[PDB]
Protein: Thiol:disulfide interchange protein
Amino acid sequence: AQYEDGKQYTTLEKPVAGAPQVLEFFSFFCPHCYQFEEVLHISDNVKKKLPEGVKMTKYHVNFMGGDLGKDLTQAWAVAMALGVEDKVTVPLFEGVQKTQTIRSASDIRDVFINAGIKGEEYDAAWNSFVVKSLVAQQEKAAADVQLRGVPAMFVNGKYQLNPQGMDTSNMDVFVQQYADTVKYLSEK
Structure:
């Protein structure tokens, strides 16, 4: 077939029931994740080819970057709670991987302040139980699928994208293959 298990995707031998339709995991410490956001814009190109009524979820993981890794997962929960993902994603990536200006929870916080989230609003969210459950959700979702590497995308809790098995001579062609694969898996 043109789309083969083991080639553009793999199948979870333990499917996850009730999983989000399209579920992406990343880390601000993850070098390919940086590429996926800044250069390839994977999330955006997938969403452009996804059907109607299919929701997109993106979660941070703890297993890279020790204590700061966990701070970032909590910060990502704040971003989701306040709906400011699109305002903080790039500066967080660049602060961790490019400029090396993110070394502490306070430095993460600076990114939100500079993006225009008010200090009181960030701190309140940071300490909120709404954010605590959002952190729990991120951890559970990763735990549900044995996650030990990022970037990772899962479709309907059944299929895991396998970018290794796609052409990468051309960045644009790679992205369309990835996106077209998500859409194929989505219509499975």
